[PDB]
Design an enzyme around this catalytic site. Structure first.
Site, PDB file in Angstrom:
ATOM      1  N   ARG C  60      -5.257   4.797   9.949  1.00 51.70           N
ATOM      2  CA  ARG C  60      -4.176   3.706  10.321  1.00 51.70           C
ATOM      3  C   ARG C  60      -3.033   4.756  10.776  1.00 51.70           C
ATOM      4  NH1 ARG C  60      -0.993   1.074  11.724  1.00 51.70           N
ATOM      5  NH2 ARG C  60       0.369  -0.572  10.530  1.00 51.70           N
ATOM      6  N   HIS C  63       3.211   5.159  11.617  1.00 47.91           N
ATOM      7  CA  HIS C  63       3.969   3.919  11.596  1.00 47.91           C
ATOM      8  C   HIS C  63       5.194   4.007  10.595  1.00 47.91           C
ATOM      9  CE1 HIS C  63       1.116   2.400   8.538  1.00 47.91           C
ATOM     10  NE2 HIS C  63       2.358   1.524   8.208  1.00 47.91           N
ATOM     11  N   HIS C  65       8.165   0.911   8.616  1.00 43.49           N
ATOM     12  CA  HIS C  65       8.514  -0.411   8.412  1.00 43.49           C
ATOM     13  C   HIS C  65       9.780  -0.373   7.533  1.00 43.49           C
ATOM     14  CE1 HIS C  65       5.430   0.241   5.323  1.00 43.49           C
ATOM     15  NE2 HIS C  65       4.639   0.223   6.437  1.00 43.49           N
ATOM     16  N   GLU C  70       6.093   0.138   0.507  1.00 40.42           N
ATOM     17  CA  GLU C  70       4.788  -0.133   0.453  1.00 40.42           C
ATOM     18  C   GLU C  70       4.122   0.656  -0.667  1.00 40.42           C
ATOM     19  OE1 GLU C  70       2.868   0.612   4.264  1.00 40.42           O
ATOM     20  OE2 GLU C  70       1.159   1.941   3.088  1.00 40.42           O
ATOM     21  N   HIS C 109       4.743   7.249   7.862  1.00 40.27           N
ATOM     22  CA  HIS C 109       3.350   7.353   7.256  1.00 40.27           C
ATOM     23  C   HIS C 109       2.289   7.289   7.951  1.00 40.27           C
ATOM     24  CE1 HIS C 109       4.758   3.267   6.124  1.00 40.27           C
ATOM     25  NE2 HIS C 109       3.547   2.997   6.029  1.00 40.27           N
ATOM     26  N   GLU C 132       1.301  -6.635   8.646  1.00 37.31           N
ATOM     27  CA  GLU C 132       0.943  -5.756   9.251  1.00 37.31           C
ATOM     28  C   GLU C 132       0.887  -5.787  10.721  1.00 37.31           C
ATOM     29  OE1 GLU C 132      -0.789  -2.462   8.764  1.00 37.31           O
ATOM     30  OE2 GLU C 132      -0.026  -2.815   6.557  1.00 37.31           O
TER      31      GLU C 132
HETATM   32 NI    NI Z   1       2.653   1.078   6.094  1.00 39.47          NI
END
Ligand code: NI
Ligand code: NI
Ligand code: NI
Ligand code: NI
Ligand code: NI
Ligand code: NI
Lengths: 356, 356, 354
Positions: C60, C63, C65, C70, C109, C132
């Protein structure tokens, strides 16, 4: 400005800049003002900006506004502020070019231009809906209270109360102009505020300097009286950049002091903008949006930026990529191991021109 | 009440008073209640008020409400409260006339009238939408849980669970009336809350006194259990005034305990109101609005006022003007230097009518 | 389920459960994901949940946010995370089955699946609108910046920048798979985060244990890096229940790890619900609502629950009634003195089948 994605710049996004330099002034006796907030700049939810000028002896009258803290940067000239706290203490101080004040929400205050020429300054409020037309004016107050109660409150006769203003004064040049600071004594015995609510930003040594590009930062570490607001001066040489970064904790409000500024803003979901700001124009970067600032001109650029948090937090792209191992970077960017090793390994905050 | 501006009092403003004295009581078995909040008093966004009475042995049943802290002033009689915290600790206490309680958001509680008189008290909630019809009732709870699960949770048979109420009881006089405080022991071993959540406000010495006018204040300094709410009792003699002031940090909710109250509210933008409150009526001053209170009658006036902050902050006009130098004041008010020097030099909190 | 009031279960109330087990997966090259938040589960205002899987060596991508912290629980397999703070420090760590991570709002992360098996994990965000599809991707970022500015900021030529992705990558299997943790060194000198942002929840001893029923709790006391969220594992034996209680300070988000769960929710004003959740389904209890959980099946039940506060606060009915004197209880419930004395005198957190 070509991009790898060929994004249509600005598509599906609000404006992140405002042509504040073209906003007409409102004229008062000895002063001028104009403002930019959510009412004309919809993105600007966290902060509103006010431009104000005061001639020598012109006073922005005693007022308060419990809906917003007030952070200021003096662009030209000299001012004097007074500031009164709920503990009944007062701060009376000169603020010169390059200086700041911070008035906590709802504390009473005044601002006077003390000359010799025009004082020009920026006020940034931590409520994007703030309007200078909606402050609580002491002259508005006393003209909108029963006369008999004003008489009783002041120990005054009707003929004395009749001499007060009949409506909000806003800015006055009635006079007298204030004199030397040492003689600006409270009419009644008043203890002094001890935590400074003014500060010298321009006179700070640069926190970061690289090839003539400079960042001066006044967060609550440098200026604890401004406990929840931060300001910075950025000087960018021709061709130089403030590197790509985001702020995890704060919106960013921007004003071009001189020169020509390019701003890019990345908003997620394949959306981004790029625009050019002239002297006196305003930018706004919502919390978390990626952004960078470039001087694409042949002349220097100077900007002031303001944050609605007392703790300056920035994650530069260079820091972020330097912190990760090669495998994470190569897998994320889908690039060769050879190119992966050429990603940033250090963060210099600014980037010097690379174009030969 | 003539003004210098000739403002139309109340024009373009919400009501700042509510004729709560005329609101009909809702009648229960041994108790009565009525309430005022945003649903009938639109300005009152920060706080809602409830009047409630309990006859001897009548109990406001065990309930909770995580949406609002509960601050109380007992006007007449005697109550007994229980209060249970998430630490599993309990406070069981008597609160007599002039006493307070504070129940933190979401903590379980009950209130009993203890004889021989009727208990009458005010409850002020730090959410203007709070309604006594929307509390979480333990009898509602157990009648709205699967019976088999209540059996399992209590270790009870079907025939035992069948004896419980089938709906919200709200107020009960089924009995028994509670006995002496020292015999009101938890049925199961329960540690005691040690930080007090009751307080004696009426028995305090005045924080401020002048000419028979008195202010008694219970902020979190006096009553730390009430960490985010403050209450005060104000006593005004005929013709006397609580001076013009504002609160930078809190809304103000008001109830007239006895007498007739005049209230003026200044809302900025050349808008203001003045009105008269009878005994049992309610006022509300939004954060930052200028206000003053006058006893224009020939009888004493007593009010309770409540703030949705635990730190009482007030800037009186007199303090503010006394803190400023002559030039600032003369320029702001556009008055002669002679008259400027007659502006306030001290703050006495109250103002008095003309003396013999 | 009969009640004393004969309430119509669910009348005048939103759904408190969502059939997340039936939500279709979105498929990527090396991973899968699906999500539940206010957009499909209207009651779920305080938290949104994401299921995600990563194949070995699938990542993943980097990114951030800033709209949501999280919190994660790894259900199967092993992951490696990287986490970069505004102090310019980094945490690179393995998180295996039963482990947690907490990424503060806006910190950068990544998450990689470590072989040999598929990593499967839950992510819970303290913003019920979180999606997401709305994260800030580093590959989206650099493809949506003027190329000349990327050249300057990286010290790269146009031909080097042209090798970067042209859009958001989201999940990548391009490689290489990461090696052992001791070899996962930052490309540039970077100081290390010292406050842990990973934690072993499943490995804790139970906070409470009764008759095989167990609660493991990771609040900020156990896991201070997760300063404003709390997670717990509940194991319920057949016929047992978590007792009636409410939370004064937090919403509660729930996911059924295995088994079949019964949830009852009391919403005041004579309104309440009872619902059965299958493995992979989700529950949500708004702050202050009374609730209880029962295993009405013949098989074990295991659930993970998450709170949007770092301080776990619960008032059990039993504690509350035990804390009050007889007169208050008899008058409230309008019952005999004899029955009053049979109300709870202690709180065992769980209740056992009679
Ligand atoms: Ni995340
Ligand atoms: Ni101001
Ligand atoms: Ni920035
Ligand atoms: Ni209550
Ligand atoms: Ni007041
Ligand atoms: Ni719970």
């Amino acid at each position: 400005w070509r991009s790898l994605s060929n994004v249509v710049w600005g598509k599906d996004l609000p404006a992140f800049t405002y042509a504040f330099s073209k906003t007409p002034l409102v004229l008062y006796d000895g002063g001028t003002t104009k403002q930019v907030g959510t009412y004309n700049f919809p993105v600007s939810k966290g902060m509103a900006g006010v431009y104000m000028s005061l001639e020598p002896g012109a006073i922005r009258e005693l007022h308060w506004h419990a809906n917003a803290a007030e952070w200021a940067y003096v662009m030209e000239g000299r001012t004097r502020i007074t500031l009164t706290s709920p503990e009944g203490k007062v701060e009376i101080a000169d603020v010169d070019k390059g200086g700041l004040w911070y008035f906590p929400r709802g504390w009473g205050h005044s601002i006077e231009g003390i000359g010799p020429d025009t004082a020009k300054f920026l006020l940034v409020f931590n409520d994007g809906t703030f309007s200078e037309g909606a402050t609580f004016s002491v002259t508005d107050w006393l003209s909108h209270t029963p006369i008999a109660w004003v008489e009783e409150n002041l120990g005054w006769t009707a003929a004395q109360v009749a001499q007060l203003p009949k409506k909000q004064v806003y800015i006055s040049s009635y006079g007298p102009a204030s004199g030397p600071l040492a003689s600006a004594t409270p009419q009644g015995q008043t203890a002094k505020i001890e935590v400074p609510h003014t500060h010298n930003l321009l006179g700070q040594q640069p926190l970061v300097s690289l090839g003539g590009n400079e960042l001066r930062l006044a967060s609550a570490k440098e200026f604890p009286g401004s406990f929840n607001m931060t300001g910075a001066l950025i000087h960018l040489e021709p061709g130089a950049m403030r590197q790509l970064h985001w702020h995890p904790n704060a919106d960013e409000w921007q004003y071009v002091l001189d020169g020509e500024m390019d701003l890019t803003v990345f908003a997620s979901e394949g959306k981004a903008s790029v625009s050019r700001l002239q002297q006196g124009d305003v930018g706004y970067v919502p919390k978390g949006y990626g952004h960078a600032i470039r001087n694409s001109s042949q002349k220097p650029l100077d900007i002031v930026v303001v944050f609605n948090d007392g703790d300056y937090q920035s994650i530069d792209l260079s820091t972020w990529l330097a912190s990760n191992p090669s495998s994470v970077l190569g897998n994320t960017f889908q690039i060769s191991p050879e190119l992966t090793k050429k990603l940033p390994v250090q963060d210099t905050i600014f980037s010097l021109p690379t174009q030969p």
